[PDB]
Structure 1
């Protein structure tokens, strides 16, 4: 599938990708922070 789409797009569909050109920028430090819900949230979530 992929190769067909690539060849169809190539004559009209420029790309860059940040890491080729934004060489002077810092990379995004990306955090996922898990949180624990409260007593009031437990009561309602359970009732649902």
Structure 2
């Protein structure tokens, strides 16, 4: 936890994030196969 939380707070003042739900209101999943 601790080291990652500091590395996140280095990035977060100059990196954006979303998760695809801003468009997966309109779009369906990948059907993924092995």
TM range (shorter): 0.5 to 0.7
In terms of Rg, which structure is larger? 1
The structure richer in helix per residue is: 1
Distance 1:11 1:30 in 2: 34
Unaligned runs of 5+ in 2: none
Q: How many residue pairs were aligned?
A: 32
Between stretches 19-28 and 3-12, larger displacement belongs to 19-28
Deviating beyond 2 angstroms after TM superposition, the runs of 4 or more aligned structure 1 residues are 19-22
Q: Could you state the TM-score of these two structures normalised by the residue count of structure 2?
A: 0.64
Query: Which one of the candidate residues 7, 15, 18 is aligned to 1:16?
Result: 18
CA RMSD of aligned residues (A): 4.4
